[PDB]
Amino acid sequence: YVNQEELNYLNQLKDIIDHGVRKNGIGTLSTFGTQSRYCLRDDIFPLLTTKRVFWRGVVEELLWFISGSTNAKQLSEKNVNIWDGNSSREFLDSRGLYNYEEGDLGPVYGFQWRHFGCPYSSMTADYKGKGYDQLQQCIKMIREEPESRRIIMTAWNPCDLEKVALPPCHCFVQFYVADGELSCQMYQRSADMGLGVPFNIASYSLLTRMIAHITSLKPGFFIHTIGDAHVYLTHVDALKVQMERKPRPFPKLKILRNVENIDDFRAEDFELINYKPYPKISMPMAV
Amino acid sequence: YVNQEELNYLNQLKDIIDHGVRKNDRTGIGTLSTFGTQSRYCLRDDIFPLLTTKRVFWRGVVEELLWFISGSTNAKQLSEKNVNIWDGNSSREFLDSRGLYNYEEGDLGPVYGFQWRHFGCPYSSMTADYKGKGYDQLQQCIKMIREEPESRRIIMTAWNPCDLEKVALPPCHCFVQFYVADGELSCQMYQRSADMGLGVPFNIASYSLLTRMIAHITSLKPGFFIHTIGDAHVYLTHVDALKVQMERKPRPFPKLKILRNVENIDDFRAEDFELINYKPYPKISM
Ligand SMILES: *[C@H]1C/C(=N\O)NC(=O)N1[C@H]1C[C@H](O)[C@@H](COP(=O)(O)O)O1
Ligand SMILES: *[C@H]1C/C(=N\O)NC(=O)N1[C@H]1C[C@H](O)[C@@H](COP(=O)(O)O)O1
């Protein structure tokens, strides 16, 4: 067996490492404009196998996004620390966000998805009923106008850029319905191919499965489009090791309950079948 | 001589026509469709991707883009330059069908130009004074290209869900990112909905021209235009005409020369652009 989708990812890593352009004083190798397709049919789920992906973090982060939260403490208290570095006192101060409490990411993903256009005050404020709920509107359009070419969720509001700890990387999403199947395309302005991309593929494939479930559709495809696709120079050796590994079949993902609505999912609803990755890679310095 | 980038476009037409999904659509005409495509067009050596297997309305590309840049949403300003491409979506009849009863004819609502130059400003009408209002994304992108060319955040969006009830037609070409490496400016545009027959050739030219303009004013060389599409479709009414086009071996693209030094994006004029050796096959109307 050969996992063509994962091999394609490894081939894109190889193209960046061997032929990418240096961009900086910390350095990357970079290319601009890539696209990959991941088949979600038969419940196959594109969780990469050549290096273990932090699946628990994928699930918890996505449920947190869906809830509309921008409070990284809520995620950290669930033992997922991936947003703690971008919401520390030191990082916030470095962005000039001196009045934000630690944990306040500003109006990032969850807020844009559920409350677009609402003025942001802080992560603890009530936003219920405020702003444009793009996530619910997309679900509505999938069900009411599946032919639509306008089923869009944006995370990009230039008016909010001064208020965010980090501008959203995964910033534009479109859904599509054909032949009883739901597909999703996500546009990512900036992608760390080594650490971010595998996690991000899983996040949006999971979102697609969740929405397909509550819209009574079968899963189609996840299409990942990238602007600046890059690898950090310090990671090149670890990625060279990873590229020598043989991808295994992807796992399957099952949803174990008839879930009521997009806000009703729980971590325990998701079963990953036969996920057998290689271990995470750590390369000691030698020079 | 053969043109590989145009051959790729023709191959995409063939795949949609032979294998696309039949969709009903907003217009009621019906389409063959695929979801998720990407193509790259090289802008090096002044080569300019104006398709050759049919004539593209170049004068309309230029005038429409200068109009976008100005921030205008008044289709009468284009129509008065004998560019009628937005007249159908801004007639009294169409505006009334969208519930836009108080718009004067010509008012497209807060579409491309308004979003590029005035994002977030409440829209009233096409004739209101928006000078200095909203977020000038176009000028901010140019500033970032000049001052922080390595940035991974050089973005212009045309999508504001809060404005969707005010527009005649929601923007099709709706997200743009710029990128600088090795002294070359590239641009990727995301198009949620692409009429492969009529729209796409025009849209490729529009964003390639914008990339050339911005490279020129920032003293960069042009790199690539990357076109990413959501719903790429062919209207059933277009299939026969597109079958004529797919039988043609594309010719090499023209070159585009910019004829004077221009320092600000708002300073370009139509006569600054010279299209060299554009040699299209006989026109195909749809
Ligand atoms: C941004 C965040 C993400 N998911 O939330 N995925 C990513 O891969 N990233 C990476 C891209 C880049 O290396 C860095 C963001 O820095 P810039 O804002 O300068 O692009 O994080
Ligand atoms: C929208 C406008 C454009 N340039 O201005 N390019 C395009 O190709 N279009 C096409 C896409 C589609 O056929 C139609 C818009 O209808 P929807 O809003 O229903 O997608 O125009």
From TrEMBL, chain A:
PROSITE patterns: THYMIDYLATE_SYNTHASE
GO cellular component labels: cytosol; mitochondrion
Active site: C169
Thymidylate synthase/dCMP hydroxymethylase domain span: 8-287
E.C. number(s) listed in UniProt: 2.1.1.45
Reaction it catalyzes: dUMP + (6R)-5,10-methylene-5,6,7,8-tetrahydrofolate = 7,8-dihydrofolate + dTMP
HAMAP family in the cross-refs: Thymidy_synth_bact
The protein, known as: Thymidylate synthase
Source organism: Trichinella spiralis (Trichina worm)
Native organism taxonomy: Eukaryota, Metazoa, Ecdysozoa, Nematoda, Enoplea
